[PDB]
């Protein structure tokens, strides 16, 4: 689809069998989801944002369906204020910015 | 123009007549620049994201040219590792997400 930016670009995703809402974030390297369980193993990681750094769980090779488009890649889980889909998955679904 | 997301979407902007590199961030409501010597009246604000909040200075009606496309609006100034172009200005240059 084509998404304008007057509102936050929030979409529904499928992850782990569950539906969630997430923000399409071109300013994020990685995909960061609110605290939850995901199948499989993980390892601790730290990531940073506007306010500093947080601890997350790094899960690899997780399938995520993003507005109907499939991706399989790293998902970080931790105390983010909002679920964000970052460039590691945006690239998989063919997303570009256009102006 | 079309910008892919293989790398961070860093582009040249002009603010205060000078050129800087900034990240096009669809996950940002607002525009955050690290330019603490702007002239002009400002007011204190707090903005947040991953890691919490920081203090910024809010400047209004500041011209910002992005990749040769003129915009004018609110700019927040504060300590950030990367200059961020948010939706307040992305909308003014006609930017969309496409997949
Ligand atoms: C989670 C909140 C929404 C998404 C987030 C994305 N912003 C980018 C900006 C870039 C860095 C300052 C971000 O955090 N990116 C992270 C996401 C985490 C991730 N791992 O992908 C990033 O790429 N982090 C890199 C580091 C980038 C820093 N740059 C650098 N070292 N050169 C990383 N690998 O850890 N938006 C925001 O942080 C913005 N917040 C908002 O837009 C709203 N605030 C809230 C709480 O939602 C609004 C109500 O203020 C800020 C900028 C104020 C307008």
From TrEMBL, chains A, B:
Topology relative to the lipid bilayer, per the entry, is:
Lipid-anchor
GO MF annotation, one: aspartic-type endopeptidase activity
Q: Does the keyword Metal-binding apply?
A: no
The Peptidase A2 domain covers: 20-89
Keyword flag Protease: yes
Q: Which Pfam families match?
A: RVP
Listed under GO cellular component are: host multivesicular body; virion membrane
Q: Which SUPFAM superfamilies match?
A: Acid proteases
Q: Which BP terms in the Gene Ontology apply to this protein?
A: proteolysis
Record InterPro entries: Aspartic_peptidase_AS, Peptidase_A2_cat, Peptidase_aspartic_dom_sf, Retropepsin-like_cat_dom, Retropepsins
Name the UniProt key words of this record, in alphabetical order: Aspartyl protease, Host endosome, Hydrolase, Protease
Protein's recorded name? Protease
Q: Which species is listed as the source? A: Human immunodeficiency virus type 1 (HIV-1)
**Lineage of the native species?**
Viruses, Riboviria, Pararnavirae, Artverviricota, Revtraviricetes
